[PDB]
Amino acid sequence: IIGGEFTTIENQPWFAAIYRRHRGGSVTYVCGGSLISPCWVISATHCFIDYPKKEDYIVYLGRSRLNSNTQGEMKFEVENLILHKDYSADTLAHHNDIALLKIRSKEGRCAQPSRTIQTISLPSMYNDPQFGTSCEITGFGKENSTDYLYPEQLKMTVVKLISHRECQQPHYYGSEVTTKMLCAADPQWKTDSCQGDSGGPLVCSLQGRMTLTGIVSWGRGCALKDKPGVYTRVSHFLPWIRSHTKE
Ligand SMILES: *C(=O)[C@H](CCCNC(=N)N)NC(=O)CN1C(=O)[C@@H](NS(=O)(=O)Cc2ccccc2)N=C(c2ccccc2)c2ccccc21
């Protein structure tokens, strides 16, 4: 997160931190996610497309720091990794950038809601917040595009939901942005999500309730003027989410 401020997991109890085991004995932070049900976490497919092996991932709930410990946190293994079939990437954009992860601890149990761990509500079938609404975003991502290290403390910030009319126009992006995407940015272009924030939640007020409106997906740079962040439009994927979280 460029700009914004440092906070704790209590401000975003639904935030899941995803880690991966690499070749050579190293473990690194990959992306963020959101707890939609006690056993289900939603993220972006591009976070796993290059390394589709579910046994190499580790999920943390209730974690406010990247390395040091936070009391009340819970470690989880990935029982099932579901990537969207129609996923495809260009040099311009990611498409159908959404993924589901079924988590389970060592005892085979799911998440236990606490003051630091809670699920986020999903939007209603084709019912998004009105454009111009203030939404929150979180993650352990970069504070500057140029940085090589991710911050140690969780960050969050606020951005404005932008209409497709605006985002789809050439003064911003173009044809690459579809109705399955949502754009949001800071009208002053000082705060935004960045590398390391992918898979994270874009939370907005829907029916006077905090709702998962989008998933951090892509953008040209980070906090670049006239280049808004692009999120996966969760509401346009409800049938998909429901059919995969059945039995
Ligand atoms: C998390 O993984 C990031 C979150 C970005 C949010 N950015 C923002 N709010 N302004 N997602 C990616 O980095 C995915 N990308 C890119 O977004 C890409 N932007 S792009 O090249 O201008 C157009 C594009 C290309 C390919 C896929 C999607 C969009 N930038 C990348 C990048 C650039 C420099 C350093 C690291 C990463 C990039 C590179 C490879 C694949 C995807 C992405």
Question: In this structure, what CATH number is given to the domain that contains residue 44?
Answer: 2.40.10.10
SS3 category, 128:
coil
60 plus 112 within the same structural domain: yes
Residues 40 and 68 in one domain: yes
Q: Give the residue numbers annotated as catalytic, written as ranges.
A: 46, 97, 198
Are 73 and 155 contained in the same domain? no
Coil, helix or strand at residue 242: helix
Q: Both 2 and 124 in a single domain?
A: yes
Report the pocket of ligand 1 as residue ranges, CB < 6 Å: 89, 91-94, 192-195, 197-198, 216, 218-220, 222, 229
Taking the CA of residue 46 as reference, the ligand 1 atom at the shortest distance is 2
CA of residue 56 relative to chain centroid, distance? 19
Distance, C-alpha 43 to centroid of its chain: 5
- Check whether residue 7 and residue 43 sit in a common domain: no
Domain count for the chain, please give it.
2
Same domain, 54 and 99: yes
- Cα(106)–Cα(122) distance, integer angstroms: 28
Rounded distance between C-alpha atoms, residue 112 and residue 130, angstroms:
33
For a mutational test of ligand 1's pocket, the pick from 31, 218, 222, i.e. the residue with the most ligand atoms closer than 8 A to its C-beta, is 218
Among 204, 246, 202, smallest CA distance to 98 is for: 202
Residues with Cβ within 8 Å of residue 111, at least 6 apart in sequence: 35, 38, 39, 61, 74, 76, 103, 117, 119
Is 136 in the same domain as 196? yes
Q: Whose CA is nearest to atom 35 of ligand 1?
A: 195
Domain that holds residue 247: 13-119+236-247
State both tokens at 243: 């059919």
* Stated resolution in angstroms: 2.4
6 shares its domain with 59: no
- From CA 78, how far away is CA 80, in angstroms rounded? 6
Residues 112, 35: Cα–Cα separation, whole Å: 11
CA proximity to 13, closest of 140, 138, 125, 134: 138
Looking at the structure, tell me whether residues 170 and 241 fall in a common domain. Answer: no
One-letter amino acid at 5 equals E
Other C-beta atoms lying within 10 Å of the C-beta of residue 64: 25
Q: For residues 155 and 209, state if they share a domain.
A: yes
Three-class secondary structure of residue 120 per DSSP: coil
97 with 4, same domain: the answer is: no
* Chain breaks of the chain after residues with C–N above 2.5 Å: none
Reduce the DSSP state of residue 239 to 3 states and report it: helix
| CA–CA gap between residue 234 and residue 237 (Å, rounded) | 5
Pair (226, 245) in one structural domain: no
- Site to probe by mutation for ligand 1, drawn from 195, 227, 230 as the one with most ligand atoms within 8 Å of Cβ, is 195
Alpha carbons 199 and 18: distance in angstroms, whole number: 9
What experimental approach yielded this model? Answer: X-ray
